[PDB]
Amino acid sequence: PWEEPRSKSKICANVFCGAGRECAVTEKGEPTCLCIEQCKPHKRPVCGSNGKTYLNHCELHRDACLTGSKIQVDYDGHCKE
Amino acid sequence: PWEEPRSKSKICANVFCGAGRECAVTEKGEPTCLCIEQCKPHKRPVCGSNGKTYLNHCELHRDACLTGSKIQVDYDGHCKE
């Protein structure tokens, strides 16, 4: 009855955005990388250089992207102690 | 047990993005407007200058934003005929 929603797959092929970032469409109709809106909540805990434990790989880098800081995974699973 | 996800509300207050656009965070940690990822699927049909019928106000402008074209609502409800 009404027009069915358009996709960004076309504008966002084949775009590479790092971990914690994904591809979206600017007001000019062209692809950018921005911080990921919501990470898929797979349970895959991870420990950051910042000493924090994150739910998964995406969440660690998404946080890095929101804060403009330098977080990386140093080891997987929860942080020590 | 793990750190709970951060929000963009802080970076995106108080940002104004037009219809069909919303606010997200760039790789530099600052707010932009980009095309809305998914419009809330409220049923509020609308007819565009482009002669197409859209599910709602957001969907018409989101399409405008993805195509870089000049769509506006000329009247609400489905298009004629």
Side-chain angles (χ1 to χ4, degrees), chain A residues 1-80, chain B residues 1-80:
Chain A
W2 37 76
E3 193 92 8
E4 282 74 23
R6 234 189 196 91
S7 205
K8 53 166 179 172
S9 56
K10 219 105 183 196
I11 311 283
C12 277
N14 46 286
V15 170
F16 169 83
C17 305
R21 299 120 237 267
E22 55 174 350
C23 180
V25 187
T26 73
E27 305 184 293
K28 294 201 153 176
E30 302 161 336
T32 0
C33 303
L34 36 115
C35 303
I36 273 160
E37 174 59 16
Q38 186 75 237
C39 290
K40 284 176 193 67
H42 287 120
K43 187 197 168 192
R44 265 105 89 148
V46 106
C47 176
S49 41
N50 69 345
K52 300 177 188 181
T53 301
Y54 295 87
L55 170 62
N56 54 45
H57 186 252
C58 172
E59 291 281 353
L60 174 145
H61 283 274
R62 178 185 170 269
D63 196 48
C65 186
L66 286 177
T67 60
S69 49
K70 36 173 167 167
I71 337 189
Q72 61 167 55
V73 186
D74 47 35
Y75 61 93
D76 61 30
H78 300 67
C79 287
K80 74 172 256 50
Chain B
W2 37 76
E3 193 92 8
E4 282 74 23
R6 234 189 196 91
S7 205
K8 53 166 179 172
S9 56
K10 219 105 183 196
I11 311 283
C12 277
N14 46 286
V15 170
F16 169 83
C17 305
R21 299 120 237 267
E22 55 174 350
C23 180
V25 187
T26 73
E27 305 184 293
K28 294 201 153 176
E30 302 161 336
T32 0
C33 303
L34 36 115
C35 303
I36 273 160
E37 174 59 16
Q38 186 75 237
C39 290
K40 284 176 193 67
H42 287 120
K43 187 197 168 192
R44 265 105 89 148
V46 106
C47 176
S49 41
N50 69 345
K52 300 177 188 181
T53 301
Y54 295 87
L55 170 62
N56 54 45
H57 186 252
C58 172
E59 291 281 353
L60 174 145
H61 283 274
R62 178 185 170 269
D63 196 48
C65 186
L66 286 177
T67 60
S69 49
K70 36 173 167 167
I71 337 189
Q72 61 167 55
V73 186
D74 47 35
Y75 61 93
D76 61 30
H78 300 67
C79 287
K80 74 172 256 50

